[PDB]
Ligand binder design. Structure first.
Ligand SMILES: CC(C)(COP(=O)(O)OP(=O)(O)OC[C@H]1O[C@@H](n2cnc3c(N)ncnc32)[C@H](O)[C@@H]1OP(=O)(O)O)[C@@H](O)C(=O)NCCC(=O)NCCS
Ligand SMILES: CC(C)(COP(=O)(O)OP(=O)(O)OC[C@H]1O[C@@H](n2cnc3c(N)ncnc32)[C@H](O)[C@@H]1OP(=O)(O)O)[C@@H](O)C(=O)NCCC(=O)NCCS
Ligand SMILES: OC[C@H]1O[C@@](CO)(O[C@H]2O[C@H](CO)[C@@H](O)[C@H](O)[C@H]2O)[C@@H](O)[C@@H]1O
Ligand SMILES: OC[C@H]1O[C@@](CO)(O[C@H]2O[C@H](CO)[C@@H](O)[C@H](O)[C@H]2O)[C@@H](O)[C@@H]1O
Ligand SMILES: [Co+2]
Ligand SMILES: [Co+2]
Lengths: 152, 149
């Protein structure tokens, strides 16, 4: 009974993000936006996460992509790009990731993700499938996909 | 530099398995080769550098349509650089640079999505971080280079 929350942006949460490995420019810019406009302290972001106690313990970033110019699904439908899916050490294999994933699935929209190489078994379980490689489209990503009428 | 266009064949496809950034690209190529789709010794977006008859470094380079990829001024086209890598025992000897410089030699802008810890090398190649655009980037951390005329 560990629920998914939309994460609010603030110095505290940005501090939490530094504990995650998949940290990069999204985080840097978030910080920059916050220090430039106070009105966006305690605002929402593309991130959803799970908390144990009051520590952020697992996160995931979500955005709906225009499928018209990203040909992944049947006759070019929009899908959710899922990224930065991560659970801190000491809290893995406990189902937080699966919980975050099924949350994304609750939107009843196709999903694309570009995972880590040493965590492909986890996605096998989430019932995602490898795309057919298209060098012009995929260019050195190894995208995984999912759509309704696969694994709820 | 001693850079070279890599030719697809079981021999070099085997050598690829020595590199860590190995995925579906290679997998697609292997079956395309063996299912007779492509021809033996056909070209690829890969370029590489040998030491002896051992493939030591490689990158995949491809000209991208800048219309649907707004990364540079006046939506011009650019080359996507990826899977760039050098085998252990050969790192920090110039091979990596040699490839990046081969790419740069065509005077087109270059975009690459780098590997975690490799930040410091890219900085030495004068690649710069794009001002992050969530809709465009989505948890990529793109780096761009363009020639300064
Ligand atoms: C990938 C990651 C998001 C999943 O962790 P998690 O959400 O707590 O895992 P879950 O409990 O939700 O996984 C669902 C199921 O898949 C399995 N699974 C999870 N991690 C796995 C692993 N890395 N290898 C093989 N199977 C795995 C689990 O056994 C789990 O239970 P079930 O199959 O019995 O139903 C998380 O471990 C992470 O943040 N990764 C860390 C860095 C990394 O990529 N390393 C992976 C190896 S440690
Ligand atoms: C970075 C990489 C892709 C190719 O680069 P390379 O061929 O090994 O390095 P090069 O000799 O061509 O780079 C030339 C310059 O980059 C610098 N450089 C390369 N890797 C570096 C690093 N990890 N940290 C600091 N500087 C680095 C070299 O010090 C050298 O600097 P100099 O000209 O001022 O003396 C290669 O190291 C690699 O495939 N490693 C993969 C593992 C990884 O990502 N970790 C980083 C290296 S341990
Ligand atoms: O207060 C009840 C319960 O909620 C927790 C964890 O779910 O609160 C966390 O989530 C809140 C939702 O916005 C955050 O405001 C808060 O920072 C975070 O702790 C726990 O604190 C508590 O057990
Ligand atoms: O023009 C070079 C010619 O020779 C080949 C092999 O016959 O050489 C390349 O590949 C070899 C390993 O497969 C390397 O030993 C060699 O250094 C490299 O040039 C062909 O690629 C090419 O037809
Ligand atoms: Co030459
Ligand atoms: Co530049």
């Amino acid at each position: 009974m560990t629920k998914v929350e939309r994460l609010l942006i603030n110095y505290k949460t940005l501090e939490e993000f530094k504990k995650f490995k998949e940290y990069g420019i999204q985080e840097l810019s978030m910080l920059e936006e916050l220090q430039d406009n106070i009105i966006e302290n305690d605002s929402t972001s593309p991130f959803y996460g799970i908390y144990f106690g009051d520590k952020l313990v697992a996160r995931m970033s979500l955005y709906q992509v225009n499928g018209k110019s990203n040909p992944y699904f049947d006759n070019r439908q929009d899908y959710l790009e899922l990224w930065k899916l991560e659970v801190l050490p000491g809290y893995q294999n406990r189902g937080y990731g699966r919980a975050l994933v099924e949350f994304a699935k609750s939107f009843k929209m196709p999903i694309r993700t570009n995972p880590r190489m040493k965590s492909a078994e986890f996605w096998n379980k989430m019932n995602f499938k490898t795309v057919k490689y298209d060098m012009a489209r995929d260019k050195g990503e190894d995208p995984l996909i999912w759509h309704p009428d696969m694994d709820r």
